[PDB]
Amino acid sequence: PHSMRYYETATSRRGLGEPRYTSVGYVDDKEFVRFDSDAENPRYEPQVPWMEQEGPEYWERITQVAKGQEQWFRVNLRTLLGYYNQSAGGTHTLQRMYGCDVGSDGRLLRGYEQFAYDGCDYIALNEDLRTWTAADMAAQITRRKWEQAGAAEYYRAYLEGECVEWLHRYLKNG
Amino acid sequence: AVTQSPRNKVTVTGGNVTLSCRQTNSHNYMYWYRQDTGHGLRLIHYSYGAGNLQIGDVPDGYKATRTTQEDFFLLLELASPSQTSLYFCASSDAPGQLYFGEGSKLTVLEDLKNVFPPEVAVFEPSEAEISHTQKATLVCLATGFYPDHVELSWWVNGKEVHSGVCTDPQPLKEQPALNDSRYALSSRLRVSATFWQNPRNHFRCQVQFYGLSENDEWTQDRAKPVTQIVSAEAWGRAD
Amino acid sequence: AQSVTQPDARVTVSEGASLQLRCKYSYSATPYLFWYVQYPRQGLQMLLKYYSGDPVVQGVNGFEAEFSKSDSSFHLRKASVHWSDSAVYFCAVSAKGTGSKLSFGKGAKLTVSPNIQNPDPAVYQLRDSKSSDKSVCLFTDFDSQTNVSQSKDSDVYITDKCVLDMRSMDFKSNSAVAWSNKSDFACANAFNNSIIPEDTF
Amino acid sequence: QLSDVPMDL
Numbered sequence: 144p145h146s147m148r149y150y151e152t153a154t155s156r157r158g159l160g161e162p163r164y165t166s167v168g169y170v171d172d173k174e175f176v177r178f179d180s181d182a183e184n185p186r187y188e189p190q191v192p193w194m195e196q197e198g199p200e201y202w203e204r205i206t207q208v209a210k211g212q213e214q215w216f217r218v219n220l221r222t223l224l225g226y227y228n229q230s231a232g233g234t235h236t237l238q239r240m241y242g243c244d245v246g247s248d249g250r251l252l253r254g255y256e257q258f259a260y261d262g263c264d265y266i267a268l269n270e271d272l273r274t275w276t277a278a279d280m281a282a283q284i285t286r287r288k289w290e291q292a293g294a295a296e297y298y299r300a301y302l303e304g305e306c307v308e309w310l311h312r313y314l315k316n317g
Numbered sequence: 318a319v320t321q322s323p324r325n326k327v328t329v330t331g332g333n334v335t336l337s338c339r340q341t342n343s344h345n346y347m348y349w350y351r352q353d354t355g356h357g358l359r360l361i362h363y364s365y366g367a368g369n370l371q372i373g374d375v376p377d378g379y380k381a382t383r384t385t386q387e388d389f390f391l392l393l394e395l396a397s398p399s400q401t402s403l404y405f406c407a408s409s410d411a412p413g414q415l416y417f418g419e420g421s422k423l424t425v426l427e428d429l430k431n432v433f434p435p436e437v438a439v440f441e442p443s444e445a446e447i448s449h450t451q452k453a454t455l456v457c458l459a460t461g462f463y464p465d466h467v468e469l470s471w472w473v474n475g476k477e478v479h480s481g482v483c484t485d486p487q488p489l490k491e492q493p494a495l496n497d498s499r500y501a502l503s504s505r506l507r508v509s510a511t512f513w514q515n516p517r518n519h520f521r522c523q524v525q526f527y528g529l530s531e532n533d534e535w536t537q538d539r540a541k542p543v544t545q546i547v548s549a550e551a552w553g554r555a556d
Numbered sequence: 557a558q559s560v561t562q563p564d565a566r567v568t569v570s571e572g573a574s575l576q577l578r579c580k581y582s583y584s585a586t587p588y589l590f591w592y593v594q595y596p597r598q599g600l601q602m603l604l605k606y607y608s609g610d611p612v613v614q615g616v617n618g619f620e621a622e623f624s625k626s627d628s629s630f631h632l633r634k635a636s637v638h639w640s641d642s643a644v645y646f647c648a649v650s651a652k653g654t655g656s657k658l659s660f661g662k663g664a665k666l667t668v669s670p671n672i673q674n675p676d677p678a679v680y681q682l683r684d685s686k687s688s689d690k691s692v693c694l695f696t697d698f699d700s701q702t703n704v705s706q707s708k709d710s711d712v713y714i715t716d717k718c719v720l721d722m723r724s725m726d727f728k729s730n731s732a733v734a735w736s737n738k739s740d741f742a743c744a745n746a747f748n749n750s751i752i753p754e755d756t757f
Numbered sequence: 758q759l760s761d762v763p764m765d766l
Contacts, residue, residue: 149759204758211653211762218345218366219766225343226766241760256763265766285766292411293607294764300586300608301652301760309758319599345765346656357646357662358600365656405599410765412655413588413648417599440692443680449756452722456682456692456733483720483731486596489713503715503733505694507722551685652761 146171147310148242148255153216155234162220164213169242170313178209185209193316223260226281235261241298243306254302272299318342319418321406325527327424327432327466327544328396336391336421338406344416346409347389349373349381351402352420358405364389401425424464424527429535431497432542434526435462439549442513444556453513455551457522459502461491468525471506474518481507518553558582560649562661570669570700571639577632577664579647588655589630591621592646594663600646606630639721639728642668670719670728675699677755679743695732695747698755704732705749712736712746 152165161180166187168176175191187206189195220237229235237260244253257267264278266285273295277286289295321338328334340347348363360373362381369383378400380392393400401424407415426432438460442453459469465488471478483505490498504522512518528542535541559582569575581587589606604613604621611623621632630647647661677698684690695704707714714734721728734746743757 201758208653208759208761214365215762215765221366222343222345222766239763258766288410288766289764292414292764293605296607296609297412297588297764298760303608304586305758306760355662358660360657363657407599409656412762412764413590413650413658414602414605415592415600415658417601419597420599438687438690439685440682441685443682443694445756446678446680446694446696449678450676450697454680454682454694454696454731456694458692458733458735480723481720483718485715485718489715491713501713505718505720505731505733507720507729509722509725549686655761 144247144252145245145310145314146242147245147306147313148240151212151216151239152236153213153220153238154236155220157232157234161213162217164209164216166209166212170310170317175313176205178206180213194313196316223281226284227260237261243302243310245307245310249307249311251303251307254299254306256298256302268295268298272302319406319408319416321404321418321421323421324419325422325466327426327464327527327529329426329429330396330398332393332396332425334393334396334423336393336404336406336423338389338391338418340387340389340408340416342408342410342416343386344408344410345386347383348405348407348409348415349379349389349391350405350407351375352405353402361391396425398425398427422466422527424466426464427497429529429533430537431463432528433461433463433499434528434542434545435459435467435502435524435547437522437524437547437549439520439522439551441551441554442510447510447513451510452507453510454505454507455513455520455522457504457506457549459500459524459547461499461501462526463497463499464528465500466527467500467502469502469504470523470525471504472521472523473506473508477523478506513553514555515553516555519550520553521548521550523548558584558649558651558654558659560647560659560661562647562664565662565664566667567664568667568669569637571671572636575632575634575637575641575666577645577647577666578629579631579661580627580629581647581649581659583628584649584651586652587628588650588652589621589623590648590650590658591619591630591632592648592660594644594646596643603645604632637666637668639668639670642666669700670730672698672700672728672730677702677752679747679755679757681743690737691735693734693741693743693746695734695751695755697729697731698752700730702752703750704747707734707746708749709736711738712741714746 148169153162155162164180166178178187241256246252258265266282275286277283318341345366349361350358359375362373364383367386382390404421406418409415438458440456488500488502492498527544561580591603592600593603594600606613613621644663646663648658680694682692717730
């Protein structure tokens with residue numbers, strides 16, 4: 144039984160400024176990787192001995208995703224403003240957490256995809272991995288949208304695949 | 318619901334054209350595509366959210382502006398004849414899931430000297446058919462038009478009909494040899510011979526044609542070939 | 557990098573018959589697969605989509621597509637094609653990290669052939685309602701199989717077959733049109749190209 | 758490698 148979690152965090156500032164993006168990786172509760180937008184050279188970097196053995200393309204590829212998640216978060220903060228009818232001056236924080244629970248037999252036991260706006264529950268992928276739980280009427284919109292477009296399935300792609308796979312690839316360096 | 322305009326426009330080499338697209342949906346992604354038989358759909362520009370632009374596969378000779386969330390503009394500043402195409406606008410809030418507009422047909426002409434509206438004629442059913450088949454078939458013909466930018470409709474007693482209609486999916490160069498040949502299109506409307514034999518019933522073939530715009534120059538000893546509608550009619554006859 | 561291949565731009569099948577439209581694409585470890593359909597004078601509409609799970613995506617209207625890991629393909633199938641299904645079908649794909657940038661196939665014009673049950677080939681002469689003489693020849697009411705060919709004369713005009721549907725009374729028929737403003741032209745003088753010996757005049 | 762961009766909210 145092992146775990147893996149990623150916590151992404153964006154925080155909007157005021158006026159002409161892109162949010163502050165933050166992502167940290169956890170291998171069974173221990174931080175092994177971290178990204179931050181503030182750093183003069185914003186890049187993914189290892190937080191644990193073993194992890195420093197991966198090649199430059201891996202960091203260049205994993206850093207590239209970050210660039211995309213920033214574009215996503217930037218756009219999705221705006222969206223959330225409308226949902227809750229909030230002044231465009233206020234600063235807010237959107238956080239994402241995803242990952243997978245592998246069994247003793249290295250299989251897949253549970254999956255995770257969930258969000259939180261300014262600390263409150265927004266939407267979360269249920270256990271059956273095909274339905275969602277929405278916290279408020281605003282999240283109920285995201286849900287309906289994700290119900291029609293097949294959000295679960297989309298994510299269930301990465302989960303059942305790369306996620307489980309790459310987890311094991313990390314459990315070999317320990 | 319994705320609306321774009323103008324649905325139809327004719328222009329000359331050098332002209333300036335702007336295609337507008339507005340989306341009632343609240344989608345972040347918007348796209349501009351062109352459709353040419355032999356190339357399918359090719360992406361020109363697209364946008365993720367208001368005030369965002371990302372080059373597409375074939376962005377040459379085009380410019381785009383995402384002014385607002387619901388508006389996305391395609392901009393042709395120096396129209397080339399090669400830009401003659403069927404243009405499409407799309408929105409999306411999910412990966413690979415696009416909602417499309419009805420499209421905008423744009424003809425970019427080299428020279429207006431050869432623009433001519435269609436000549437429409439209606440031909441009444443044959444008597445032999447009426448007796449042999451017990452059904453009357455009208456035929457409509459649009460001829461001598463250029464460019465290939467027309468819409469043909471049938472009208473029975475004031476109402477456009479679709480049942481019993483079939484129009485050529487493609488025109489045909491009257492003289493295929495010439496690069497800028499005139500075109501000709503045919504359509505059929507079949508009705509129960511009973512219906513045709515009633516002199517009270519009225520049949521009209523309607524051809525919408527897109528040619529020169531009002532504020533366009535025309536220096537020829539011709540009847541200026543402007544965007545117009547040309548029709549030919551026929552009354553039922555008992556005999 | 558990403559490529560989508562649809563083999564045949566033109567495909568015809570008899571109403572009620574089965575159908576398969578093929579689609580192969582460049583390999584992606586995880587690919588996002590879609591089919592789009594475009595009816596006359598409309599835009600594209602999404603027909604089917606695949607992301608993950610059961611590789612057989614079932615459409616509510618009898619269509620279905622299957623993801624093939626090995627083939628790296630996403631072929632579209634329908635057991636029994638209705639006549640409405642006549643349209644242009646597009647295969648599109650997007651890869652992880654670019655899942656919002658679709659790659660499209662050149663498409664396929666699906667022509668659902670009409671099943672002419674009581675065919676009686678014929679050629680009638682239709683006369684202008686305005687101008688008393690200027691006329692046109694009409695090949696019509698023939699069989700699904702038989703086809704039309706370009707004018708051998710080249711001074712005479714002729715349009716490929718065309719199917720109309722008198723919905724009001726569940727009836728369908730094919731139709732070709734011939735004409736040449738050259739006063740000299742007869743019914744048998746056109747359609748000289750491979751017409752049934754059974755057609756009337 | 759990790760997940761792809763989530764579908765918009």
